[PDB]
Amino acid sequence: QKPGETKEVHPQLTTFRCTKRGGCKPATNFIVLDSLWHWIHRAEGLGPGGCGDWGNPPPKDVCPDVESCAKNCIMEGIPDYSQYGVTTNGTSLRLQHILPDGRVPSPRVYLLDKTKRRYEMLHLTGFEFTFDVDATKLPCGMNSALYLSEMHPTGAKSKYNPGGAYYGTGYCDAQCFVTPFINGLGNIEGKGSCCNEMDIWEANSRASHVAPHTCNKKGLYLCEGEECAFEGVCDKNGCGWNNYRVNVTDYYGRGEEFKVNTLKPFTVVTQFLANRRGKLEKIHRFYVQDGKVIESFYTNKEGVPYTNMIDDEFCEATGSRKYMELGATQGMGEALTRGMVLAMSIWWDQGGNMEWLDHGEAGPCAKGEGAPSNIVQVEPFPEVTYTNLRWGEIGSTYQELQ
Numbered sequence: 500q501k502p503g504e505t506k507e508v509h510p511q512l513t514t515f516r517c518t519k520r521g522g523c524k525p526a527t528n529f530i531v532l533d534s535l536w537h538w539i540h541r542a543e544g545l546g547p548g549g550c551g552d553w554g555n556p557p558p559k560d561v562c563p564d565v566e567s568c569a570k571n572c573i574m575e576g577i578p579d580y581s582q583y584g585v586t587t588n589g590t591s592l593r594l595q596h597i598l599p600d601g602r603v604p605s606p607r608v609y610l611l612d613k614t615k616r617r618y619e620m621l622h623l624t625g626f627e628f629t630f631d632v633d634a635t636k637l638p639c640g641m642n643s644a645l646y647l648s649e650m651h652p653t654g655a656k657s658k659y660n661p662g663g664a665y666y667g668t669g670y671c672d673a674q675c676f677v678t679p680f681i682n683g684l685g686n687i688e689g690k691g692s693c694c695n696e697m698d699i700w701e702a703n704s705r706a707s708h709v710a711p712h713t714c715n716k717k718g719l720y721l722c723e724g725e726e727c728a729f730e731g732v733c734d735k736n737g738c739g740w741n742n743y744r745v746n747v748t749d750y751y752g753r754g755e756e757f758k759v760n761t762l763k764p765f766t767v768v769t770q771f772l773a774n775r776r777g778k779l780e781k782i783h784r785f786y787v788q789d790g791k792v793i794e795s796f797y798t799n800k801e802g803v804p805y806t807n808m809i810d811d812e813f814c815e816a817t818g819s820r821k822y823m824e825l826g827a828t829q830g831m832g833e834a835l836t837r838g839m840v841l842a843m844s845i846w847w848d849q850g851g852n853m854e855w856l857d858h859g860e861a862g863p864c865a866k867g868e869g870a871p872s873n874i875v876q877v878e879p880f881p882e883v884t885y886t887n888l889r890w891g892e893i894g895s896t897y898q899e900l901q
C-alpha cells in the first residue's frame with residue numbers, strides 16, 4: 500500500500516556482533532512494525548473502509564489490480580511506537596501485549612539495519628545467536644516470539660511498494676498465510692505468503708519451544724490452493740523442541756525447582772552447528788542464569804533417540820515428516836546461510852489458547868488456562884523484554900562465573 504504523510508519514527512536498538520578474539524562490539528539497529536500493523540485506509544474520495552482483513556485478498560472495489568490498490572490504499576506512518584506497546588532503551592526492546600489503557604496492540608516487529616532502508620540480514624549457519632529475556636509476565640497462553648523468516652532484504656521495495664522494509668513490508672513465514680498485501684502489493688489473487696522460518700524462541704514463563712520449519716522454495720513464495728496447505732511447499736508443524744514433549748519436566752518453569760527459573764531473567768543461547776563443508780547438522784539450545792551455564796536437557800522418551808540437540812534423526816523420529824521432505828536440517832541451514840530477517844512478537848490465541856506451546860504434552864498449563872479471559876486474571880498486562888541481542892562466533896556471546 501502507498502505511504503501517506505504521517506511520518507514513521509523508528510525506535511533505535513543497540514545490538515552486538517561477537518568474536519572470540521574481539522568480544523561483543525556494539526552495533527546500531529532500528530525497529531520496524533509490520534506493515535499490516537500500520538493504519539491502512541482508502542484514498543481520498545473512495546468511501547469509508549480499509550483495504551482488507553488478515554486472511555483475505557484486498558477488497559475488490561478498490562483493488563481490482565495491483566496498480567489500483569497501490570494508489571487507492573494508504574499506509575500511514577507510525578510516529579510514536581509507544582502507542583503500539585513497542586519501546587527501546589539502549590540494548591533493551593520492550594513489547595507490551597496490552598497497554599495501561601486496555602488497548603491490545605500485540606506488536607510484531609522486525610530488525611532494521613543501520614540505514615533503516617533494509618532489514619538486518621542474519622547469516623547464522625556455523626554461528627550462534629543469543630539474547631537475555633525477562634519472561635516473568637507471560638502466563639499460560641501467551642507467546643513471546645523471536646524468530647527468523649526468509650523475507651527479502653528491502654521488503655521487496657518496487658514501483659508499487661515504495662515503502663519497503665522501512666514500513667515493515669514483505670512478511671512471510673511457514674504457515675503460508677493470506678494477507679491483504681504481500682510484499683507491499685495488493686494480494687489480488689489471495690495467495691499465501693510462504694518462506695523458511697527458524698523459530699528460535701516461542702515461549703512464556705511455563706514453557707519454551709524451539710523449532711526450525713523448512714520450505715522447499717527459497718525466499719518468499721506466493722502459494723495458491725494446495726501449495727498453501729498442510730501437504731504443500733512449507734512445513735507448518737516444524738520439528739518441535741520442548742523439554743516437556745521429551746519427558747523432562749523440571750527443566751524450565753517458575754520456581755527454584757526448575758533448572759531455568761522463569762521468575763528471574765536469563766540468557767538464551769542458540770548455536771547452528773555445521774560440518775566442515777558448512778551444512779547445518781545440529782541446532783543446540785542452552786541457557787545461562789545466575790552466572791551458570793545450564794546445558795540442554797537430554798530427551799527422556801521412549802521411541803525418541805537419545806539426544807541433547809535438534810537433528811534430522813530426532814526430527815524424523817518425532818514425526819516431523821514435512822520438515823524432512825521439504826529440505827530437512829540441511830535445508831533449514833541453507834536459508835540461514837542465504838540470510839534471514841529477525842522478527843520479534845508477543846500474542847495470544849483466542850481459538851486454541853496456545854495449547855501446543857504449554858499444555859498437555861507441551862507443559863503444565865491446564866485446559867482453558869490459556870484463554871485470553873483467563874490470561875488477564877493472571878496477568879492483566881503481559882509483556883516481554885529482550886535485551887543485548889548478540890551474535891557471532893561459537894563460544895563468544897555468553898560468559899560463566901566461577
Ligand SMILES: *[C@@H]1O[C@H](CO)[C@@H](O)[C@H](O)[C@H]1NC(C)=O
Binds near residue numbers: 746799800
Ligand atoms: C518419562 O520419564 C519418567 C522418569 O524418568 C520415566 O519413568 C517414564 O518411563 C518416561 N516415559 C516414557 C514414555 O518414556
